Amino acid sequence: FVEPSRQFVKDSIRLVKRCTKPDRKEFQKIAMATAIGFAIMGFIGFFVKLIHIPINNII
């Protein structure tokens, strides 16, 4: 009942040697995509704390 776990780990190392890997161009492409998508929704909370500290000073 450890040989099924042996089968799982040998199947997983057989899988990740079959998968295709992002090496240097598509890695930078998807990193630029998530960087611009994070820079869109990141600064919205920054604008929340820009709008709110006059409102927090008032109330």
Next chain:
Amino acid sequence: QFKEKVLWTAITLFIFLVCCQIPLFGIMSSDSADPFYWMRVILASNRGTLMELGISPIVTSGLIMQLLAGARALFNGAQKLFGMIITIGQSIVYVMTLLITIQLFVAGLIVLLLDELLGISLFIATNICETIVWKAFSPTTVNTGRGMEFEGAIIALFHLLATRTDKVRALREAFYRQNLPNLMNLIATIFVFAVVIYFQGFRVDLPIKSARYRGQYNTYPIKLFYTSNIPIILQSALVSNLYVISQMLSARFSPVGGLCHYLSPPESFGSVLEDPVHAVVYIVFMLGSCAFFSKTWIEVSGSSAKDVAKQLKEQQMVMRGHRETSMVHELNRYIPTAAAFGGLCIGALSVLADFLGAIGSGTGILLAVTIIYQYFEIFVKE
């Protein structure tokens, strides 16, 4: 769409800002906010009513009525009302341990309209994307034991460098602080993003020549995260943030540190503390239980191996290998391992968002990247 895809998110931004407001039915400290503290990365972030039980109780109440009807316009219309009365009925006991009706009704109906005519995960994605910038721009505190008005954040060090000399002690203070957002900590939340955006693009590629068309290689990708970080990290959060607050509630109605030896995600730089067996049991949970959630999620949510052959065959697509039906086994050597290991490696990369400690608890900070990718695919699609 170009204007529509920005306009809908502008509506959702405004209804997330107007539902980033506190009620005025009486003010207390964090006493009714301790159960909603652990549900901060569940829907939205307040110590009060903001977006409590907005859109997902509508869907689960739909699941309850589907289960009753099993064991369209009227159904979809009663969806909003039945999912909206239950959040007010739960805010009754959230007060006892009026404003929220039209607020969460429009918070449900707007995303229902952009999911029907034209975004549940976008709320948590905004909740994490504000958190990374809030923990980077923190100049807002009353003067503590060190600093001027600062929390040791990035703009805090920017306005602290010119007024404070002795950079040799300042670098070790900026690298070894454990109560505030640090400077060595924000490089870890870039390291975890640069590692998980590399592990996101792992996929297995399979060939398909469509039927009666000589050589259209529409290849089909079987991703490593075959199951986006959504339906596993949501399951880890839905077991953790409910068991934690139930252990809060039942211990005071009939333990927080009396039973923490299997609960706590460690967030210490010296992680070989007084309970090193707790780290082992926590890593066994954060691997095995979520990987079991993934392997049990494939066989339910219509994307198993024996169902994806139906979705391939209905599209008039065939493999370029053996027979009309051995396409099941010709990918069933890859689907259950890319569910099991695809649930284990994401658990390991949520562990190493806490063992190092990146910006948060390893749950929302690692599940926010799949919503960025899942909206990237929408943006590149149309």
